[PDB]
Amino acid sequence: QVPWSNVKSFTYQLTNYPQGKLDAIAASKFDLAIVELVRDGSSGYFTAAEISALKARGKQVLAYFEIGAIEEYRPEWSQVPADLKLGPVSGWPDEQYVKYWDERWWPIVQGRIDRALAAGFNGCYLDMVVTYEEIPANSAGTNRADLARKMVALIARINTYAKARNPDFKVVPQNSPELVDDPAYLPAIDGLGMEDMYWSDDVACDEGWCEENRTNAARVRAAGKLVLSTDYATQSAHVADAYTRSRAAGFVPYVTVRALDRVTVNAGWDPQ
């Protein structure tokens, strides 16, 4: 395997696995792959044998899963009572933000960690960290800063649990880099995934919020964590700009399509 410290490229695909298999990802030349635990968006977990097949080609493999929301099409839906739900993510009630600090949410999270370990992933790639800021500020009867501390506490809980079972198992939150301000954050993570720092569907991330994301990523990188940047662009000047600026900042870039439904290969930028 490529060591964690020498990861210099990654691909990232969450759906549309051909024939429900990882063969195209296995064949690609990236140092690291982010894939779902499941081949079907639901309960068809990839097996140790399938994950081993990627690792044998030298890749680190991270398991994407959400820690801040649940969806009706996911197997744990029926374990989530109404009291854990905080509202629709994108208007559709079949995708709900959850009370991620609640002890009743922990078995769902734990079960995903356990599945990641059972399939021999190298680590986890944690989505819906942003739940901390997307739910009402009074969701825990407190405020936004308390919700932030709760989300960092959950990431730290994940890390301690996972490392106890595999001390090599990496923890990589996606987005929400500003959580780095909490002292419990950097001791709980091994890397950070950041979307949309440079190019978002071929539109520049040129707002103040973009710059704050980049400088918070710089904070995480300064603490020796792997930063995997994903940008979304097909225009060649934009692809080049994301790769160039990401690498200049000390990050590891990938540029792909928002659907995350294929292994994009950007000739001249990605390994071939």
Numbering used by the authors: 197 to 468
Give passages from the manuscript.
Whereas the fungal enzyme belongs to family GH114, the two bacterial enzymes do not lie in the current GH families but instead define a new family, GH191. The TIM-barrel core structure with fully conserved active-site residues and a negatively charged substrate crevice is conserved among all the families.
Here, we describe structure–function investigations of two bacterial enzymes: an enzyme from Thermotoga maritima previously suggested to be a galactosaminidase and another from an environmental sample (termed Env-GH191 here), which has 99.2% identity to an enzyme from Myxococcus fulvus with NCBI reference WP_074950922.1. We could not detect any binding, or enzymatic cleavage of the GAG oligomers, for the T. maritima enzyme, which raises the question as to whether the T. maritima enzyme is an endo-galactosaminidase or whether GAG is not a substrate for this family. The enzyme from the environmental sample was tested with purified Pel and showed good activity towards the isolated Pel, with a preference for GalN-rich oligosaccharides, confirming that the new family GH191 has members with galactosaminidase activity, with a preference for partially deacetylated stretches of Pel. The two GH191 enzymes overlap well on each other, with an r.m.s.d. of 1.48 Å over 252 residues, while only having a sequence identity of 28%. Whereas helices α1, α6 and α8 are absent in Ega3, both bacterial GH191s contain the α1 helix as a structural element. A comparison of the substrate-binding crevices shows that beyond subsite −3 in both bacterial structures a loop around Asp64 (TmGH191 notation), connecting β2 to α2, partially closes the crevice. In both cases up to seven subsites could be identified. Whereas the Env-GH191 binding crevice seem to better fit the galactosamine oligomer, the FsGH114 crevice can accommodate either an acetylated or a non-acetylated GAG oligomer equally well. The crystal pathology of Env-GH191 was dealt with using a nonconventional procedure described in Section 2.
